[PDB]
Amino acid sequence: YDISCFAAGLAGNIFALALFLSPVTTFKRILKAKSTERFDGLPYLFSLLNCLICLWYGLPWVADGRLLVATVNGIGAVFQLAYICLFIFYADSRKTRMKIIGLLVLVVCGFALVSHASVFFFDQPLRQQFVGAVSMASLISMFASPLAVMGVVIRSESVEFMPFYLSLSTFLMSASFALYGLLLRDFFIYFPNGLGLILGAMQLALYAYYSSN
Template sequence: MRPEFNQINVYIVVHRSVLNLKFGFILRDDTVIQVNFFGLALNIIYVMIFYQYSEQKGQVWKNVGIAGAFGAAIIGYAEMEDPKLVENRLGAIITAFMFFLISSPLFHLKHIIRNKSTEGMPFPIIFSGTIVTFMWLLYGIILKNKFLILQNIVAFILCAFQLGLFVVYPSKPKEKSKAKAKKTN
């Protein structure tokens, strides 16, 4: 997997949290606000740790600035948009970000199938994402919120498909596993 692609995901996650927090305020839903406030705090800590270990600190600042400007523009739009339209439009923007973020490991599907390995795919994130999207799907059904339902049906299917790849393919390519076995003998 390309590290610069994973770096982009770091900033999308943080700004998605900000947009979801804004969406929670628009919905006046305390649960969405609390969960996304906590998620935003965790994501900020994650970016700080990512920055600490990054070899390209200037690039990190550049990406944070670009993502911050983009996020500010979307929030500015949400502030100026007609209150009757903003829920649906901001929900669509958040849905697009979510689909991009969750499906990003599948951008390397050709490589995964060719090498018959899920090496580089973030199993803990995909596994927890599957559980979380299912829980948000149930919450969306309870609220009868079409964006939460749509987002999380598609997200759950994407996560479940990615989990299925771990069942079909090992996390290490066969060549590497064989090479390690020969070295130990």
């Protein structure tokens, strides 16, 4: 019973590694110029903020018996950090440079603030509930982009901006982590990951629809 839970966690984590390779396309495009035209820099920053707070949830002081999420969000957050660090010097125009760096300062300092406030002001079991609520809120907030790109596919009647390799992996990742939180009976892990399972399932199905015809 335990073994299956742990295996599920490892599987979900390793699956997340695949989703993390998705933004490499714009990063290929940076050598010429890094804006990117038609695209906006902040989401990567946003994603890292999320991964930070979730990593906070993962740590043993906040919630006991919840080790693996700290692992996936940790390696994920670090890899994101690499992205923003790469962006800011290669940023186009000083204005963009300063904006992204500033927002980064905001994220790091703020996360330090909520980490500190969380560990100081809150005693168990409240601490877990709070950091949990914030984590679930972040994960749910993130889902906006896949829903939007789904909208774009419907509008264009074409998968012109939606890759399958990324999508299938994310579907598997949500299913796995949903199983993780469900088996662990921790709601904060289960719910958003289940919602992600739904959004991904819709993604795969609609992809079948527009790839077919």
